[PDB]
Amino acid sequence: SRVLLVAGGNPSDWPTIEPATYDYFVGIDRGCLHLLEADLPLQLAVGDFDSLSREEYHFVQETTETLIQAPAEKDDTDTQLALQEALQRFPQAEMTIIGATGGRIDHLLANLWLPFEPRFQGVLRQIRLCDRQNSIQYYAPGSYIVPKEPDKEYLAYCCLTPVENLTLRRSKYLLTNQDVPYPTSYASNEFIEEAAAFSFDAGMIAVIQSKDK
Amino acid sequence: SRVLLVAGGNPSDWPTIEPATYDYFVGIDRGCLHLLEADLPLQLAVGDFDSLSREEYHFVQETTETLIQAPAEKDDTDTQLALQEALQRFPQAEMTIIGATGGRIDHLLANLWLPFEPRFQGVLRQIRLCDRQNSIQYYAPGSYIVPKEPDKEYLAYCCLTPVENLTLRRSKYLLTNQDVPYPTSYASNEFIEEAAAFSFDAGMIAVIQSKDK
Ligand SMILES: Cc1ncc(C[n+]2csc(CCOP(=O)(O)OP(=O)(O)O)c2C)c(N)n1
Ligand SMILES: [Mg+2]
Ligand SMILES: [Mg+2]
Ligand SMILES: [Mg+2]
Ligand SMILES: [Mg+2]
Ligand SMILES: [Mg+2]
Ligand SMILES: [Mg+2]
Ligand SMILES: [Mg+2]
Secondary structure, eight states, rough: EEEEOOOSSSSSOOOOOOOOOOEEEEEEHHHHHHHHOOOOEEEOOOOOOTTTTTHHHHHHHHHHHHEOOOOOSSOOOOHHHHHHHHHHHHHHHHHEEEEEEEEEEHHHHHTTTTTHHHHHHHOOOOOOOOTTTTEEEEEEEEEEEEETTTTTOEEEEESSSSSSEEEEESBBBBBEEEEEEEEEEEEEEOBBSSSSEEEEEEEOOEEEEEEOO | OEEEEEEESSSGGGGOOGGGGOOOOEETTTHHHHHTTTTOOOOOOEOOOOOOOHHHHHHHHHHHHSSSEEEOOSSOOOHHHHHHHHHHHHHHHEEEOOOOOSOOOOHHHEEEEEGHHHHTTTTTGGGGEEEEEEEEEEOOOSEEEEEETOOOOEEEEEEEEEEEEEEEEEEOEEEEEEOOOSSSSEEOOOOOSSEEEESBBOEEEEEEEOOOO
């Protein structure tokens, strides 16, 4: 199953959205207005909403089929929350996160690092960060094949941690049994034939496919 | 001493720059043109310059005073190369990298993990990356004062690695003796004074100051 989570970021940085392929639509704070003004469903609405006018928060209030209202002073970001909740409703679903990039970078990182958290690690394989130019997936140790997304021009293996014994095949550039001692971002690989593959014994890796301006 | 480096990003997303403050100007690929079309100096030109026309690259070759033209096929990104060259010439200068804004997240993380590289570790305290919206500084374990940037609203402690004993004061949000078991982005913190402070025993943190669009 497919859930789309929409954060406050600007919708111009959004990926190509095809609503037929999403089953549940979550709004985070301003993503709610953003989903709505985009003529897209709004099933869940999450956050403190302290970035909206009363006239906007009522609009959201009247439309979402479910409003989770948080305090302003809490631990979790609105987004950790939306993910926690959407995962309750859809424990095996693919979480496509959106509007979480293109601006503040301390906020981008907080999103890039969501799989790191115990409550999410279990579903790192379903957590998916997207914007017009990038497309990020997560992987724990193992052996995988990565099918090329059509619109993306480049491939990258970003080790978010020290990685052990990393081998890449079926891609313009290779590593065999490479040790990655500190976070390294093997950055501008390219696909050779519709799919590449890699294996590694330890750490985490964000697989980023992307394309230019 | 300060050195200023310019990647090929759109200059629209540049920080406000004051040139008096820099003693050396470094162009990176298409950033070489951005410097000249902004009536600023170009003293070091670096890259493979494949993004440039034959005519633009003729203009960058007459104007610069040192040209480093490198193979399109290398391990290093143009920016990795330019940084090492420039530190070769100014080993104690504070490197400010702007225009690293192209939008590709493999390159974003390529840049953000620079200090990790054994050839840059010895100067992490010297490396800065800046955006219209963002300003990034690196820290190894110690005790520090973090002077507020006048145009910025937010403060963030982005732990690039598991951090240990993270104490953090004079902020609008505190941690104290905090163990951070994996990468964690404590973002959207605020200054209460003109300076904040923090300390830690192990790992590496990227202090980030940011503001809204
Ligand atoms: C393991 C393997 N991954 C893929 C890389 C691909 N490679 C390393 S960096 C990159 C060069 C890109 O440099 P550039 O984007 O001009 O620099 P920028 O100006 O954006 O700083 C090449 C393709 C290969 N060398 N090694
Ligand atoms: Mg379907
Ligand atoms: Mg909020
Ligand atoms: Mg409100
Ligand atoms: Mg280039
Ligand atoms: Mg080389
Ligand atoms: Mg202390
Ligand atoms: Mg301490």
